[PDB]
Amino acid sequence: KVFGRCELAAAMKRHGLDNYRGYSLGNWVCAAKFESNFNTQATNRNTDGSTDYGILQINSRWWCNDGRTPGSRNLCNIPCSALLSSDITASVNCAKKIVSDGNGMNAWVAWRNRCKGTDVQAWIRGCRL
C-alpha cells in the first residue's frame, strides 16, 4: 500500500502515535516520507547485512525476525514480513518500542537528517484529523 500523506497521518493518529514519547504527528509522517515514501512494502538492505522493513523501515538487527540477520534479536516478537502489511498496526506497535529506547527518534537516520529541527507540522497541513 502506498499511503497518501493525510491518509497516513490519520492512521498514525488513530494508533496513538501523535505525541507518543513527545513526538508530534508531523515528526512521524515526515519520518515515513523519507524512510519509505509512504510505501508499506518498502525494503532496503543495510551494509551490516540487516534489512529495514515497511513504512518506518524497522531494522531486523534488533526488532523483527527475517531469518538472515545473524546474531540479531526480535524485540517486537514479529516476522519482519508482518511489517509490510497494508495495515500499519504492527509497524506502529514496534515503532513505539523503538522510540521508547534511549535515543528517541534519532534511531531513524532519515528523521535525524531530514526531519529533526524542521517545520514538521507542515506534514499534516490540510489534513482533516
Q: Which residues are annotated as a binding site for substrate?
A: 101
Name the active-site residue from 7, 18, 48, 52. Answer: 52
Give the x/- contact pattern for Na ion in 46-65, rule: CB under 5 A: --------------x----x
Nearest to Na ion by Cβ — which residue? 72
Give the x/- contact pattern for Cl ion in 27-66, rule: CB under 5 A: ----------------------------------------
Cβ partners under 8 Å of residue 82, min gap 6? 64, 90
Query: Which amino acid would we find at residue 100?
Result: S
Coil/strand/helix, residue 119: coil
Our answer to whether residue 52 is catalytic in this structure is: yes
Give the nearest distance from C-beta 58 to Na ion in angstroms: 10
Closest CA to 81 of 47, 51, 38: 51
DSSP string, 77-116: -SBGGGGGSSSTHHHHHHHHHHHTSTTGGGGSHHHHHHTT
Using rule CB under 5 A, residue 10 touches Cl ion = no
Give the nearest distance from C-beta 56 to Na ion in angstroms: 16
